[PDB]
Design a protein around this ligand. Structure first.
Ligand SMILES: Nc1ncnc2c1ncn2[C@@H]1O[C@H](COP(=O)(O)OP(=O)(O)NP(=O)(O)O)[C@@H](O)[C@H]1O
Ligand SMILES: Nc1ncnc2c1ncn2[C@@H]1O[C@H](COP(=O)(O)OP(=O)(O)O)[C@@H](O)[C@H]1O
Ligand SMILES: [Mg+2]
Lengths: 188, 180
């Protein structure tokens, strides 16, 4: 229908990442790629808060303090990459950091706490099954709210919004390596 | 507390360079210097990707096919040099080729086409000013390209990168890494 460059969504992030990193005293080099990539104009408002949340998660939970990254033998400065591109009939948006990765042990503990799984079933969960708990509505306690809709935001809300746009989301994460979240939205 | 010879990352290039040259129909004499230069293990592990990008750039955009160098009145075989040395409290790595050199007019034309500068302004730019457009994200055409990825990885190591080039003489990319 009506395509516009994704820069309408991306433009405000450099400054927000700068301030967020400074507030949580993290050294972060923010990289944005493919701002010219176009998407439906009716996706602009809705995809913004969800993306901000993924960026916040990277800065807060992913990128470790300089001292910790040096101990791990990693580049002192963490890298946060926000990218967009066209891949077939879809707009692909990625948020990737080279931080400590999602604490899967913590996710399992939370899942058990929320009655989503029994402890006997947790030992054999695959990484994908574990990371997927993050998409269960109500999984995250929440606090950060969407300046657009007004609902608290967690990975569960991110997935819910992405599904509302008829798209999908996947997560990849390895301990001390980092986390990569990929969102695929339809072109039309 | 973990210095290690840069040879741990340099040793893998001779074969990469040869395969790239054959793939691109370029005849290149590859030279490596200061492979005994010690630097933080971390930098050694991370600098591989960037250096590969610079070496590939030299073999692709820089070194001209032997037939062209001959026609141009230059030594038939192209020369590509990868070196490391100490300069005060910094390790300096350089990738230099004696190719055609970065086309600065091409850069200027692109900047004008993208609306970054008008013609009058383009005429007053210094060479360094022109070359730095190569670092503007998105400036260059289609994992992340070459110069953008090189500068970002280098700066994540608290390093610095500069470019130098002369038409038909060649290009030299310099990377400065801190002492740990
Ligand atoms: N050694 C060189 N000699 C001549 N031109 C060069 C050299 N290195 C870089 N360039 C020029 O600088 C521009 C950009 O290099 P870079 O950012 O690595 O992009 P790329 O080579 O076009 N594409 P990609 O293959 O994605 O990295 C090139 O497109 C060339 O025009
Ligand atoms: N990029 C990331 N790096 C490391 N951990 C992450 C990342 N993104 C999310 N997480 C982890 O997943 C859990 C939940 O994320 P989410 O549902 O967005 O909740 P929250 O809003 O509480 O930050 C987080 O509490 C954190 O432990
Ligand atoms: Mg390149």
């Amino acid at each position: 229908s009506h395509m516009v460059p994704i820069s309408f969504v991306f433009n405000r992030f450099p400054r927000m990442v700068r301030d967020l990193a400074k507030k949580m005293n993290k050294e972060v080099n923010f990289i944005m790629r493919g701002e010219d990539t176009e998407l439906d104009r009716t996706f602009v408002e809705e995809i913004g808060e969800p993306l901000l949340h993924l960026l916040r998660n990277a800065i807060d939970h992913g990128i470790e303090p300089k001292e910790e990254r040096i101990a791990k033998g990693k580049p002192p400065i963490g890298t946060l990459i926000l990218s967009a591109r066209h891949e077939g009939n879809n707009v692909v948006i990625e948020v990737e950091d080279d931080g400590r990765g999602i604490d899967k042990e913590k996710i399992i503990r939370k899942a058990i706490e929320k009655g989503l799984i029994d402890e006997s079933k947790a030992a054999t969960l695959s990484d994908q099954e574990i990371l997927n708990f993050l998409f269960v509505p109500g999984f995250s306690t929440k606090e950060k709210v969407s300046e657009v809709s007004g609902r608290g935001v967690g990975m569960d809300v991110v997935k819910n919004v992405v599904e509302s746009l008829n798209g999908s989301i996947s997560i990849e994460s390895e301990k001390d390596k980092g986390t990569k979240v990929t969102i695929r939205l339809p072109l039309t």
